[PDB]
């Protein structure tokens, strides 16, 4: 016997499971179309150098990499954003801006699952918070389309610029700001003692550490304004963001949370993440603005960007908990049934007619009795059974039976 289990940490999607995945992806595609985003894709295999950021990111640490026979260092992508930037950079100033690009790549890791699909949505060339507004509204729209409400989920929002100021003002070199965000990102998950210890190892003293902890636990935007003024660029941007989301009609879906930083080095501005309001699951999605990445890739001119990723695993757990993923059985419009094998040529002509009319149709393929053919029709979820028998055929007719029998002229079948 060959090994029937898939490779470690990887999923099979036989038809039943594939229908569930399609239910999800259909929503990602449909939301992207609704919001005017354009699809793209890139190879699952990228150069490892693409991901060397040196900020202690979990994503870059857990990289599924290997060496080709040719000696080239490659990885199965841990995320899509670097691939997106490569594409954008490759287009040069022929790229028309603003650009709104989406994809649903399988991404990988090695440490538990080693693969997941991740809906990616990115707006490129837009400096203002309107980009983040649209992105967050798109994530809410996807969740609403799956049957969830603002009672089930929300999106927590913050800006890294608040922390940027505190870190700069405390005398810390800005090369440590990204590593700091990575550490601070672990705040909720591990003990405060341990997070402070990690900040200590970076070469930051207790005073600096205190200033960071205090700002992360500020519970409102007015309180941020007290620490940094009402006209600190982050205050205006957040307020603008909330005003715009409210005008769009998703005000009940979003809220401020000063503890949201995200785990990736490249975010520079607004950051956000989706969560379930029962506090049972990990983040549903996550993103933010990353205005410097393209500059760090060698873009001659800075290109503002913002986007998010939205994984396939947590959302499904949530939807299952809420009873929003019932199995949808397979369906087919018609099952054509030869009365016997001598009727097969005629039944094939009928099959052609039905498909020509845009219907989905099967024909009984092997030899079986009429009753078993009706049972098969039921099992495959046929709406209609079309029996092709000698006597009806002589009359220019077939027998039609709605499954969820009467003689009908061929032409009236469709």
Ligand X SMILES: N[C@@H](Cc1c[nH]c[nH+]1)C(=O)O
Closest approach of ligand 781 to the CB of residue 158, in Å: 21
Burial class (CB in 10 A: 0-12, 13-18, 19+), 268: buried
Closest approach of its own copies to the CB of residue 208, in Å: 32
Q: Does 307 bind ligand X (CB under 6 A)?
A: yes
At 28, list the tokens. Answer: 């990602």
Q: Does 107 bind ligand 781 (CB under 6 A)?
A: yes
Q: Does 314 bind ligand 781 (CB under 6 A)?
A: yes
Is 291 annotated among the ligand-binding residues?
no
Beta strand ranges found along 68-160 (DSSP E)? 73-76, 99-103, 106-108, 115-124, 153-159
Of all helices (H) and strands (E), which one includes residue 83?
helix 81-91
Is 109 annotated among the ligand-binding residues?
yes
Mark the segment that binds ligand X (CB under 6 A) among 42-50, 230-238, 284-292, 398-406: 284-292
Q: Does 67 bind its own copies (CB under 8 A)?
A: yes
Angle between helices 221-228 and 233-248 (to 10 degrees): 160
Nearer to its own copies, 300 or 409 (CB): 300
Q: Does 154 bind ligand X (CB under 6 A)?
A: no
Contact letters for its own copies, residues 326-365 (x by CB under 8 A): ----x-x-----------xxx-xx-xx--x--xxxxxx-x
List the beta bridge partners of residue 45.
Answer: 76
411: left (phi over 0), alpha (psi -120 to 50) or beta: alpha
Closest approach of ligand X to the CB of residue 42, in Å: 13
At 121, list the tokens. Answer: 């949505």
Nearer to its own copies, 42 or 170 (CB): 42
Alpha helices, DSSP H only, in 302-343? 314-321
Integer Cα distance of 381 and 174 in angstroms: 62
Q: Does 280 bind its own copies (CB under 8 A)?
A: no
Interacting residues toward ligand 781 by CB under 6 A: 107-109, 113-116, 311, 313-314, 317
Residue ranges for the known binding site for L-histidine are 79-81, 109, 118, 122, 262, 266-267
């Amino acid at each position: 016997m060959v090994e029937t289990e898939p490779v470690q940490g990887c999923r099979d999607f036989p038809p039943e499971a594939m229908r569930c995945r399609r239910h999800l992806f259909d929503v990602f595609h449909a939301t992207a179309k609704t919001f005017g985003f354009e699809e793209y894709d890139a190879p699952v295999l990228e150069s490892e150098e693409l991901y060397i950021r040196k900020a202690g990111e979990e994503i870059t640490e857990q990289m599924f990499n290997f060496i080709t026979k040719g000696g080239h260092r490659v990885a199965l992508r841990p995320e899509m954003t670097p691939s997106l930037a490569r594409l954008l950079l490759g287009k040069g100033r022929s790229l028309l801006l603003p650009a709104k690009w989406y994809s649903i790549p399988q991404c990988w890791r090695y440490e538990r699952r080693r693969e997941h699909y991740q809906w990616n949505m990115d707006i490129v060339g837009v400096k203002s918070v309107s980009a983040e507004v649209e992105l967050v509204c798109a994530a809410c729209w996807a969740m609403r389309s799956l049957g969830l409400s603002s009672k089930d989920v929300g999106i927590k929002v913050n800006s890294r610029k608040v922390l940027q100021t505190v870190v700069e003002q405390a005398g810390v070199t800005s090369d440590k700001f990204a590593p700091v965000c990575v550490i601070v990102d672990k705040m909720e998950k591990i003990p405060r003692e341990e997070v402070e210890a990690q900040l200590a190892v970076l070469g930051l003293e207790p005073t600096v550490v205190d200033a960071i902890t205090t700002t992360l636990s500020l519970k409102s935007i007015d309180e941020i304004a007290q620490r940094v003024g009402e006209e600190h660029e982050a205050v205006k941007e957040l307020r603008q963001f909330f005003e715009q989301v409210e005008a769009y009609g998703y005000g009940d879906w979003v809220l401020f949370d000063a503890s949201v930083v995200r785990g990736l080095a490249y975010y520079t501005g607004i950051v956000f993440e989706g969560f379930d309001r029962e506090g049972k699951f990990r983040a549903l999605c996550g993103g933010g603005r990353y205005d410097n990445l393209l500059t760090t890739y060698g873009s001659p001119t800075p290109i503002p960007c913002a986007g998010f990723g939205f994984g396939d695993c947590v959302i499904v757990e949530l939807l299952q908990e809420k009873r929003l993923l019932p199995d949808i059985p397979h369906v087919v419009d018609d099952v054509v049934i030869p009365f016997d094998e001598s009727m097969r040529p005629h039944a094939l002509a009928v099959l052609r007619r039905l498909r020509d009319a845009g219907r989905s149709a099967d024909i009984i393929l092997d030899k079986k009795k009429v009753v078993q053919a009706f049972n098969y029709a039921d099992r495959v979820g046929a709406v209609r059974a079309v029996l092709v028998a000698p006597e009806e055929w002589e009359r220019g007719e077939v027998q039609v039976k709605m499954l969820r029998g009467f003689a009908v002229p061929l032409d009236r079948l469709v």
